[PDB]
Amino acid sequence: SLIVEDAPDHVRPYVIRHYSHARAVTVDTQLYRFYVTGPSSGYAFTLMGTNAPHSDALGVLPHIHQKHYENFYCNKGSFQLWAQSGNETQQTRVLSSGDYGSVPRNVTHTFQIQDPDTEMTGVIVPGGFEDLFYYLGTNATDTTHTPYIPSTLQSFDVYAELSFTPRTDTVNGTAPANTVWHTGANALASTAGDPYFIANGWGPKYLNSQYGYQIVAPFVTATQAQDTNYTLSTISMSTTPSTVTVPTWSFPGACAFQVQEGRVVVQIGDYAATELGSGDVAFIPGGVEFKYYSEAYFSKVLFVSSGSDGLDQNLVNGGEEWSSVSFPADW
Amino acid sequence: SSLIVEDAPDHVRPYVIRHYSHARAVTVDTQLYRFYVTGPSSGYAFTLMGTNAPHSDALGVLPHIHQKHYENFYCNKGSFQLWAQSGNETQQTRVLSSGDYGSVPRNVTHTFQIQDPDTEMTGVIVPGGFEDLFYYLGTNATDTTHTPYIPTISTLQSFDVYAELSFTPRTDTVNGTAPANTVWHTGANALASTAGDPYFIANGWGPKYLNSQYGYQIVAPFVTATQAQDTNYTLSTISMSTTPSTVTVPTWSFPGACAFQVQEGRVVVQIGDYAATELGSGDVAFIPGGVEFKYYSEAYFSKVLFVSSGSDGLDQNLVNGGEEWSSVSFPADW
Ligand SMILES: *[C@@H]1O[C@H](CO)[C@@H](O[C@@H]2O[C@H](CO)[C@@H](O[C@@H]3O[C@H](CO)[C@@H](O)[C@H](O[C@H]4O[C@H](CO)[C@@H](O)[C@H](O)[C@@H]4O)[C@@H]3O)[C@H](O)[C@H]2NC(C)=O)[C@H](O)[C@H]1NC(C)=O
Ligand SMILES: *[C@@H]1O[C@H](CO)[C@@H](O[C@@H]2O[C@H](CO)[C@@H](O)[C@H](O)[C@H]2NC(C)=O)[C@H](O)[C@H]1NC(C)=O
Ligand SMILES: *[C@@H]1O[C@H](CO)[C@@H](O)[C@H](O)[C@H]1NC(C)=O
Ligand SMILES: *[C@@H]1O[C@H](CO)[C@@H](O)[C@H](O)[C@H]1NC(C)=O
Ligand SMILES: *[C@@H]1O[C@H](CO)[C@@H](O)[C@H](O)[C@H]1NC(C)=O
Ligand SMILES: *[C@@H]1O[C@H](CO)[C@@H](O)[C@H](O)[C@H]1NC(C)=O
Ligand SMILES: *[C@@H]1O[C@H](CO)[C@@H](O)[C@H](O)[C@H]1NC(C)=O
Ligand SMILES: O=c1cc(CO)occ1O
Ligand SMILES: O=c1cc(CO)occ1O
Numbered sequence A: 001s002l003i004v005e006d007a008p009d010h011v012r013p014y015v016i017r018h019y020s021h022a023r024a025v026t027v028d029t030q031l032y033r034f035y036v037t038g039p040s041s042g043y044a045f046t047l048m049g050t051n052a053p054h055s056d057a058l059g060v061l062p063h064i065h066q067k068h069y070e071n072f073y074c075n076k077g078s079f080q081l082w083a084q085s086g087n088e089t090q091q092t093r094v095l096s097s098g099d100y101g102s103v104p105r106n107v108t109h110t111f112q113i114q115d116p117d118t119e120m121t122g123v124i125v126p127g128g129f130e131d132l133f134y135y136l137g138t139n140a141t142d143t144t145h146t147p148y149i150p151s152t153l154q155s156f157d158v159y160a161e162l163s164f165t166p167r168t169d170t171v172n173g174t175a176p177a178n179t180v181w182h183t184g185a186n187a188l189a190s191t192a193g194d195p196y197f198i199a200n201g202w203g204p205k206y207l208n209s210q211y212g213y214q215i216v217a218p219f220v221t222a223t224q225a226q227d228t229n230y231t232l233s234t235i236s237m238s239t240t241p242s243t244v245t246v247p248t249w250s251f252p253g254a255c256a257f258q259v260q261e262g263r264v265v266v267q268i269g270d271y272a273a274t275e276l277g278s279g280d281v282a283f284i285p286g287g288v289e290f291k292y293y294s295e296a297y298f299s300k301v302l303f304v305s306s307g308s309d310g311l312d313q314n315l316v317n318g319g320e321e322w323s324s325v326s327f328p329a330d331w
Numbered sequence B: 001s002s003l004i005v006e007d008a009p010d011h012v013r014p015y016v017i018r019h020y021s022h023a024r025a026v027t028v029d030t031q032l033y034r035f036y037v038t039g040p041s042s043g044y045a046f047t048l049m050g051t052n053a054p055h056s057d058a059l060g061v062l063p064h065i066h067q068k069h070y071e072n073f074y075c076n077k078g079s080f081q082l083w084a085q086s087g088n089e090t091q092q093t094r095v096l097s098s099g100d101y102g103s104v105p106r107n108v109t110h111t112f113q114i115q116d117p118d119t120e121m122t123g124v125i126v127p128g129g130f131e132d133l134f135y136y137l138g139t140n141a142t143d144t145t146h147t148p149y150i151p152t153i154s155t156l157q158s159f160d161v162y163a164e165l166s167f168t169p170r171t172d173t174v175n176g177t178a179p180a181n182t183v184w185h186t187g188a189n190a191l192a193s194t195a196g197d198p199y200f201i202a203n204g205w206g207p208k209y210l211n212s213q214y215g216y217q218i219v220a221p222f223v224t225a226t227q228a229q230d231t232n233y234t235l236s237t238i239s240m241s242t243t244p245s246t247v248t249v250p251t252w253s254f255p256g257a258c259a260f261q262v263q264e265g266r267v268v269v270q271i272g273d274y275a276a277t278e279l280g281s282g283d284v285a286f287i288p289g290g291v292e293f294k295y296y297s298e299a300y301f302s303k304v305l306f307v308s309s310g311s312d313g314l315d316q317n318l319v320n321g322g323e324e325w326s327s328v329s330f331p332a333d334w
């Protein structure tokens, strides 16, 4: 009974399929889904999905969160993201599938949906921010499970930035001009509090060969999370050779993952093993044993963990710097 | 009887080949080719192949023409630039990203270039058998772990590859397109009405039809009779809802072979007397012409890349049974 249609109201092992109801709400043309919520994760983090059509206007007015670190991962389609810390140069990228944008506390930001089939996976730390979407949004029954329908919010940690003007000199999906976006490697900001972007496949990667091949592409480490105390990355996986036992994991902090590509089998606690496909999400409470392996010859998941030393950091630590998005051809 | 094979069969029969299966893999430099459907596996109806490769600062192939093959470029993930020219018409170029499509009819000069590290192009060539070229050009790859990719004019002409040495890929690309008076991810893309002309369809920006006969299905045509002419096939994506209360998953049969590769979601396919099988991203199913099959989506929304030999296979059938639709999403109510 691992599978649920809305995130549970208390911490427990669960899997929720892509486009499940997930307390769906709409905000104009956008449809939000809350795969993992405050209640659901013990307030460790929120993992939500936003589906939306092209829009000629910003999806939200510029604003800041003082207590929440926000992460934007493009599942598909595309959306532009703007960000600025203090008086540092304003940054903007157009994110396509697999691209990532990091938005720390106190960073002014906004976004705009570009493509007709756009999906933004949002990871917010800590959890509970979603209350704002319940409040400002309109409930959506969404019977068919269709992806989307064809200055007063300080209480909700939303602080307006009405002076902020989103730059309009974007060329080749980025601005300012002296940036690298899909044309060279990207690094995680070394300065805490600064926003940064990693184009799909262009960031640092680490190969782990302890249990078949796994490639971790870090998005947020301790360096960036500081006191928010979490890590975020993608983990690409080979199959597990028959001569390797699939390891059993346990971590103090809750963790979760959304499959982006492939077929991943997860077994959590005393629940039956379940195979996840695109956009499917698995949530594992802290201190609960879990095993996972890829049935597909190559899978890739978006992974979030509460704590400084969860699964992704563990695989990196037991691994090595790696230059490719593909793993070795030989075991 | 399991549909699953590791390489395409040397004859026609129902099968399913998993993403990144060996598929008779070969490499040409950094590029890894997989032949999910071949001439012999499809009765020469068409070829469906996967090309995985890293970024390159150089073209991935010298500009050339095919006089007897219609080429189709679909970006499964990552991105790559495609240039195409018909005769003396303006040279067109687009940077395809996930879900984008490039159509390259016969006698159209073309080349491509890999941009992102994890780029995958799904190629559909009609008719089938064109893969012989890659058997010659490529080196057999064992790829034990199934990693996506590894980290002469007389002979080419005989493979229907006619070099165009004077072709100069244009260098004025901006926002992933050139020339300037073009529409790429900023508006509607129509299928070309003139045969032999190349065209490009950005993910979700092309024409769509909503079929409500068996739940909701949205067909986004990539190639129709208009464009295929004598090559006699269709190509498109089909997006699907789950099958709702009172509705039974229907059974289909069409004279020409057909196939699909899942892009998103989870799709169950049952072909002939074989056991049903659930497919995930990149997985391919092949259905011989004249064999009965059923498919449905276990996922709340799935999207597949579909090809059919003949002018009236599944996709055209759904279009004919449906109505023009303006969204990539289906209605919220049954
Ligand atoms: C490549 O793509 C980028 C987007 O990724 C695109 O950038 C866009 O440029 C247009 C045109 O410059 C911008 O729209 C303008 O923004 C400015 C700055 O605020 C406004 O002053 C403009 O308003 C005037 O012009 C309007 C339309 O002509 C009038 O209707 C209006 O009343 C004003 O007179 C105008 O809206 C847009 O802001 C950017 N977008 C981003 C996100 O940067 C660029 O054009 C593309 N490059 C090429 C060469 O194709
Ligand atoms: C936007 O990106 C394009 C490439 O997609 C750049 O175009 C290249 O520009 C240089 C200089 O003109 C040429 O030598 C290359 O041949 C071009 N490549 C292509 C594929 O056309 C373009 O310069 C970029 N624009 C800006 C302002 O950054
Ligand atoms: C963000 O700014 C507010 C007010 O300036 C401050 O109280 C808060 O501690 C800041 N947090 C961070 C992480 O900068
Ligand atoms: C970070 O989170 C982990 C997992 O929840 C927890 O064990 C640890 O106490 C936290 N560390 C800090 C500094 O709060
Ligand atoms: C392609 O061009 C060749 C060269 O002239 C010509 O013989 C042939 O008829 C053309 N084929 C098509 C399909 O237009
Ligand atoms: C590569 O494999 C193909 C098909 O299995 C075979 O026909 C060919 O002889 C092989 N190439 C070499 C040089 O071994
Ligand atoms: C087009 O293809 C279909 C299916 O393969 C076939 O039944 C039909 O006869 C073909 N038409 C021609 C002219 O070959
Ligand atoms: O700026 C934001 C945008 C979205 C949409 O994903 O969610 C939360 C935000 O704070
Ligand atoms: O031009 C071509 C490019 C590729 C790359 O996959 O395959 C076949 C071709 O004809």
Ligand SMILES: [Cu+2]
Pocket: A063, A064, A065, A070, A109
């Ligand atoms: Cu925000």
Ligand SMILES: [Cu+2]
Pocket: B064, B065, B066, B071, B110
């Ligand atoms: Cu070609």
